Amino acid sequence: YRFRIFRAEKTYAVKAGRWYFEFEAVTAGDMRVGWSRPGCQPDLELGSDDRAFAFDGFKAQRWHQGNEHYGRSWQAGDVVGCMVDMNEHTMMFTLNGEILLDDSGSELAFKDFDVGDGFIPVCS
């Protein structure tokens, strides 16, 4: 029979040289890391505006006004190193020491952005 945005002090903005920092993630959830201008908004999506250039490893998307495929996703217990060059307007990201590549086979993330008032490290 409801994401949280954490950044550094706006006075620590950089306008010259090369600057690098680490973001360690013990979880592989929704996290974005990058650099934002000292006008980025605390409630809007990180990178979705002109005020922030970021990267989300959950979907391997570089975050700008729009999302473009970039690099690879991380796992639980990784670290992403973000490097920025003011002198050449260069954005670069290394996942566990491995430089991430775009669909065009270039180690860059972002080119041709105005220095403006500077850039500050930021995560979401």
**In 3-state terms, what secondary structure has residue 21?**
strand
Instruction: Supply 30's token pair.
Output: 């929704």
* Resolution to 1 decimal place, in Å: 3.3
Burial status of residue 67 (CB atoms within 10 A of its CB: 0-12, 13-18, 19 or more): middle
Which residues, listed in sequence order, are joined to residue 37 by a DSSP beta bridge?
none
Answer for the pair 72, 80: CB distance below 8 angstroms, yes or no.
no
The length of the chain is 124
Instruction: Supply 101's token pair.
Output: 């590549």
Which residues, listed in sequence order, are joined to residue 64 by a DSSP beta bridge?
66
- Cβ within 8 Å of residue 89, ≥6 positions away: 110, 111, 112, 113, 115
Beta strands in 26-105 (DSSP E): 32-36, 52-56, 61-64, 66-69, 78-85, 90-95, 98-99
